[PDB]
From a paper:
Like LdoA and EcdK, GriE belongs to the 2OG-Fe(ii) oxygenase superfamily, whose members couple the decarboxylation of α-ketoglutarate to substrate oxygenation/hydroxylation via an oxo-ferryl intermediate. Recombinant GriH purified from S. lividans TK24 lacked the characteristic fluorescence of the expected F420 co-factor but nevertheless led to 4-MePro in a coupled assay with GriF, indicating that GriH can use NADH directly without requiring F420. Together, these experiments suggest that 4-MePro biosynthesis starts with the GriE-mediated hydroxylation of l-leucine, followed by oxidation with GriF. The crystal structures of the leucine hydroxylase GriE have been determined in complex with substrates and products, providing insight into the stereospecificity of the reaction.
The canonical iron-binding motif is formed by His110, Asp112 and His210 and has lost the metal in the apo structure. While the residues 159–176 were not visible in the electron density of the apo structure, this region is well defined in the ligand complexes. A third loop comprising residues 232–247 is tilted away from the active site in the ligand complexes.
Author numbering:
A (entry chain B): 1 to 158, 171 to 265
B (entry chain A): 1 to 103, 105 to 158, 177 to 265
Write the structure that this text describes.
């Protein structure tokens, strides 16, 4: 499973690329049932919404649900990831982000790499983020907004909650890096660069939007933290190369 | 300037219709210069943001800036409006709403019930005409309609649960188009405004045209004339481009 030449060049130039229809509706169903089951596990890997009534983020479902292990090693994701990075890979981070219905606007613009570098000791942006749409993503249910091409800016040379950017910063960025929101049916995949600027739009719809993000990292690019590292469910520690898996996802207890 | 057969049907079934490029870039420019001039006029018709820094809304700019008079009577707006209502028309309300950059809102509402029960508007024999003074994109806070929700009419004198039920039958749709575009929408349609997550303000002009025979009959103290029109004299339609005019 490979990106076309144009898809590679789109990833390189714009910082993201959308692969619609990567996983079938049957596969989406299997993953959604596994997500519902995993949301019942109580732990600090599960971030509840402010009102505590729903799950906002879930870390490391692939360690608890076999379907998500299957996904994480699927040819359809690791093929494109290996194509881009040309090395053995392991899972730096696995998370499922839920944007609740009627969720309101939050200032969430950020860049992944600078946090991983300065908080977690990630040396270099030799990684790729891979999103899997567990919901249809539309203009109304809180799509990810990229600043197109903004990964070309690199990252400044130089606790996690201290990082942020100002409206004035965002304004300057949009000048050369316009807002773009990939929209597609559940089962679609998008790959995006660790140094791209992104945020999610508010979900004004009555339905939650579930977005799975796997970050694959070069086994030679393992974090070298200076202090106590964050939990393994946030930042992977096992750099054993992933074994790729061929075939459909299937229900697995 | 007539709506096509499909555009009439669209308006009836879905409650809104978009006419892209109705006014040209040069006409948008003249309108935008008039907007900036009117935004400096102090008065109760000018609604500023809570920080007093910028203007959030302007009422009745057509009474102060000649190009907005020209706009308000353009045959490109009155042709469609007269075609839909088949009567003489006057201006019920003229408003410019500016959605500041980086500004949720939860603005789901229907105009007619407000005008009926606040102002004594008898019937929904009016049409709302939006004119895009800025581009309208998915990011700068477009109006979001619940398609077809005007078919519900209006109860005799909303919540998330109600909105969730509504969207099943009346899906969200947001007209998006370049500045100068026009959209007409039904007084009974449910609409809101998505948040503006962009760095630029979005300026949307709404003219409500009303049947001269449907003038408000308020039982209470009428709202001021710059909010709710009182002069029911039929509008004279104006042909031709907009032009700068002191």
């Amino acid at each position: 499973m490979q990106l076309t030449a144009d898809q590679v060049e789109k990833y390189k130039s714009d910082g993201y690329v959308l692969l619609e229809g990567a996983f079938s509706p049957e596969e989406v169903h299997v993953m959604r049932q596994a997500l519902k089951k995993d949301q019942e596990v109580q732990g600090p890997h599960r971030i509840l919404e402010e009102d505590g009534r729903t799950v906002r983020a879930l870390y490391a479902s692939h360690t608890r649900q076999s379907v998500f292990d299957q996904l994480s090693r699927s040819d359809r994701l690791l093929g494109p990831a290996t194509q881009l990075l040309e090395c053995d890979l392991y899972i730096h981070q696995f998370k499922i982000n839920t944007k609740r219905a009627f969720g309101g606007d939050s200032w969430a613009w950020h860049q992944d790499f600078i946090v991983w570098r300065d908080t977690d000791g990630l040396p270099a942006p030799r990684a790729v983020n891979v999103g899997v749409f567990l919901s249809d993503v539309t203009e109304f249910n809180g799509p990810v907004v990229f600043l197109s091409g903004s990964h070309q800016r690199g990252t400044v040379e130089r606790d996690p909650d201290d990082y942020s950017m100002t409206p004035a910063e965002l304004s300057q960025m949009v000048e050369k890096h316009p807002m773009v929101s990939p929209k597609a049916a559940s089962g679609s995949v998008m790959l995006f660069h660790p140094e791209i600027i992104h945020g999610s739009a508010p979900n004004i719809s009555p339905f939650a939007r579930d977005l799975l993000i796997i970050t694959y990292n070069d086994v030679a690019n393992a974090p070298k933290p200076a202090g106590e590292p964050r939990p393994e469910y946030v930042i992977g520690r096992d750099t054993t190369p992933l074994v790729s898996r061929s075939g459909p996802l299937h229900e697995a207890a």
